[PDB]
Amino acid sequence: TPQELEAYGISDVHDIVYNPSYDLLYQEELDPSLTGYERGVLTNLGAVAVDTGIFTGRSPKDKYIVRDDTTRDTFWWADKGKNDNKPLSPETWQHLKGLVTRQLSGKRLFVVDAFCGANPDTRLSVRFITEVAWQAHFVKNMFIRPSDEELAGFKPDFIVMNGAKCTNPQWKEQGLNSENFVAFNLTERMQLIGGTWYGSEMKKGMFSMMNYLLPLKGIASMHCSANVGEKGDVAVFFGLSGTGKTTLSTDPKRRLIGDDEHGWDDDGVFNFEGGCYAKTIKLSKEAEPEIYNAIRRDALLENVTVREDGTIDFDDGSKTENTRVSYPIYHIDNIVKPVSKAGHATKVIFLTADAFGVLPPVSRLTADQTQYHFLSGFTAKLGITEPTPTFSACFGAAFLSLHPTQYAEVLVKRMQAAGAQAYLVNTGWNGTGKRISIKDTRAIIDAILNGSLDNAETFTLPMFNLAIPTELPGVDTKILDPRNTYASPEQWQEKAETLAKLFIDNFDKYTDTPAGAALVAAGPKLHHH
Numbered sequence: 028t029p030q031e032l033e034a035y036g037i038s039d040v041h042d043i044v045y046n047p048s049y050d051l052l053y054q055e056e057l058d059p060s061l062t063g064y065e066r067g068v069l070t071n072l073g074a075v076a077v078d079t080g081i082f083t084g085r086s087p088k089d090k091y092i093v094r095d096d097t098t099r100d101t102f103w104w105a106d107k108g109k110n111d112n113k114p115l116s117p118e119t120w121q122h123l124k125g126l127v128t129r130q131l132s133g134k135r136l137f138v139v140d141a142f143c144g145a146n147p148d149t150r151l152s153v154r155f156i157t158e159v160a161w162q163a164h165f166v167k168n169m170f171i172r173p174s175d176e177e178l179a180g181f182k183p184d185f186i187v188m189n190g191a192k193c194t195n196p197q198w199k200e201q202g203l204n205s206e207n208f209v210a211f212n213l214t215e216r217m218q219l220i221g222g223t224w225y226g227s228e229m230k231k232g233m234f235s236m237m238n239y240l241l242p243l244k245g246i247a248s249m250h251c252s253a254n255v256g257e258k259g260d261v262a263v264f265f266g267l268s269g270t271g272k273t274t275l276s277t278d279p280k281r282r283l284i285g286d287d288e289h290g291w292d293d294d295g296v297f298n299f300e301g302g303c304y305a306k307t308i309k310l311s312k313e314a315e316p317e318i319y320n321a322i323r324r325d326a327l328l329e330n331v332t333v334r335e336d337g338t339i340d341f342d343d344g345s346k347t348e349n350t351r352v353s354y355p356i357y358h359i360d361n362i363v364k365p366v367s368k369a370g371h372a373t374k375v376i377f378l379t380a381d382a383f384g385v386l387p388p389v390s391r392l393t394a395d396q397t398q399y400h401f402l403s404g405f406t407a408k409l410g411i412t413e414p415t416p417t418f419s420a421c422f423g424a425a426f427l428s429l430h431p432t433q434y435a436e437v438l439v440k441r442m443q444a445a446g447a448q449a450y451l452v453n454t455g456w457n458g459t460g461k462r463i464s465i466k467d468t469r470a471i472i473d474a475i476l477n478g479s480l481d482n483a484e485t486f487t488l489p490m491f492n493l494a495i496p497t498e499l500p501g502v503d504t505k506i507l508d509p510r511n512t513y514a515s516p517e518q519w520q521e522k523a524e525t526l527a528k529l530f531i532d533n534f535d536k537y538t539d540t541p542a543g544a545a546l547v548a549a550g551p552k553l554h555h556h
C-alpha cells in the first residue's frame with residue numbers, strides 16, 4: 028500500500044510496481060522514450076546493457092555508518108587500522124533520509140522483496156525501493172528471490188532506499204566527503220543511497236550488514252566464492268576484487284554454491300546471494316564458457332561498449348575496466364539447488380594477484396601462515412608498472428563491520444573443526460610481466476581440490492617461507508618457483524625484499540595482542556636494509 032510506503036517517509040506514490048517480473052523489467056529498460064542513464068540497450072546475446080553513470084564502481088569514500096548506542100562499542104570505526112566505516116550522526120542521517128524519501132516521493136517506484144542469506148534462521152528480509160528499473164533488476168538478480176509463499180508473509184528486516192538521482196547540498200557543512208552518500212543505520216535498519224546509481228552499493232551494503240550480524244553469533248561471514256565436488260568436498264576461495272573468485276569457482280567440474288558472499292555455520296557453507304556478478308573486461312568465450320553463456324535475457328550488462336549492430340566489444344575499457352554482468356545463479360548450468368549451500372569446507376584457498384611477481388603460483392600454508400595472510404589480505408595492481416600494494420584485512424576490509432580479528436577467530440574455529448587445509452594462490456604476475464594463464468591456474472585449483480598437494484613434496488621459498496609443491500600435473504614445473512621466471516634469482520630477491528617489508532609494516536598493527544605478536548613468526552622475515 029501507499030500507506031506502508033508512507034511509514035518509511037515516502038509520500039504521494041502514484042504507481043507501485045511490487046515484485047517486478049523479469050519480463051516487465053525487460054520492457055521497462057527498453058522503453059524507447061527513456062533517456063539518460065535509465066535507458067538500456069538490447070545486445071545480440073539477448074541481454075540488456077545499461078550505463079551506471081558517473082560511478083562505475085563503489086564509492087568507499089562516501090560510505091557512512093551512524094554511530095549510536097547500538098553501534099558505538101561493536102562497530103570497527105574508521106576514526107578509532109584503515110577501513111571505510113566513517114561515523115555519522117543520527118541528526119545528519121535524518122537529513123539524508125529526507126533527501127532520499129523526498130526524491131522517491133511522487134515517483135513510480137519499484138519495490139523488490141528478497142533475502143540475504145540462504146538459511147531462514149540467519150537471513151535478512153530486505154526490501155529494496157528504487158525509481159530506476161535496472162536497479163530493481165540488479166537486486167532481483169543478486170539477492171535471493173522469495174517464493175510466493177514467502178512473499179505472502181514477508182516482513183522486512185532491512186530497508187534499502189536508493190535515491191541515486193538526488194544529491195546532498197549540505198555535505199560541506201556536515202563534514203562529509205562529497206554530495207553523494209552511502210549511509211547505514213543499524214537502529215532503524217536502513218541503507219540510504221544518494222548520488223551514485225551504481226547497483227552494487229546495495230549488494231555490498233547488505234553484505235556489510237551480514238558481516239556485522241553473523242560473526243556476533245559465531246557464524247563466519249566471508250568474502251569468498253564456494254563450490255562442491257561430486258564427492259561432497261567443499262572449497263572456498265577468498266580474495267580481493269579481480270583476483271579470481273568468480274572466474275575460478277565457475278568450474279564445470281564442480282557445483283557452484285556462490286561466487287562472492289558466504290557464511291559458515293554449524294551445518295556448513297551457505298551463499299548469501301541469488302546471482303553472480305562477473306567481470307566482463309576482455310571476456311573470452313573459450314576461457315570462461317559458463318560465464319559467457321550466462322549472458323542472455325535477464326542478465327544485466329553494465330558499462331560495456333555496444334556497437335551500432337548490437338554486438339558487444341568486451342575488450343573496450345574506455346568507460347571503465349570494471350565492466351560487469353549480473354545474472355541469477357541458475358544461468359550457470361552446474362549449481363547447487365534448490366538451496367545454495369553445502370557442508371563444511373575442507374579446502375580454503377586465498378587468491379591474490381601479486382603485481383610484484385614475487386609470490387608463487389601455489390603454496391600450502393601452515394595454520395599460523397593461514398591466520399597471518401588472512402589478516403594481511405594482500406593483493407597488488409599494476410606506461411609504467413609501479414606495483415601498487417593493497418592490504419585489505421580478511422580479503423575484504425571494505426565490507427567488514429567488526430574488527431578483522433573477529434572474522435579470523437570464527438574462521439579458524441570453523442576450519443579446525445572441519446580439518447581444513449589452506450593454500451595461497453597467485454593468480455597474478457611472475458617474472459615474465461604477464462599474468463599466469465587461466466588454464467594454468469585452473470590446473471592448480473584442480474590439484475588442490477583432488478588432494479594432489481596435501482602431502483606432496485615441497486621446497487621452501489626464502490623470506491616468505493612458503494612450501495611449494497615440487498611438481499603438479501598439468502602445469503609447467505618451471506613456473507612453480509617464481510625465481511625461475513627472472514633472469515636470475517637476484518632479480519626476484521630484490522622485489523621479494525620490497526614486498527616482505529610492505530607485509531611487515533602492514534602487520535605491525537595486529538601485534539598489540541599476544542596472539543597477534545605470535546603470528547609475526549609466520550610472516551615474511553626481513554632483518555636488513
Ligand SMILES: Nc1ncnc2c1ncn2[C@@H]1O[C@H](COP(=O)(O)OP(=O)(O)OP(=O)(O)O)[C@@H](O)[C@H]1O
Binds near residue numbers: 266272304462464
Ligand atoms: N589466472 C587467472 N585466474 C583468474 N582470473 C584471471 C586470470 N588471468 C586473468 N584473469 C582475469 O582476472 C579477472 C578475475 O575476476 P573475478 O571476477 O574472478 O574477480 P573476483 O575475485 O570475483 O572479484 P570481485 O570480488 O570484485 O567480484 C577476470 O577478468 C579474469 O578474466
Ligand SMILES: [Mg+2]
Binds near residue numbers: 272286305
Ligand atoms: Mg566476483
Ligand SMILES: [Mn+2]
Binds near residue numbers: 250268287
Ligand atoms: Mn566481491
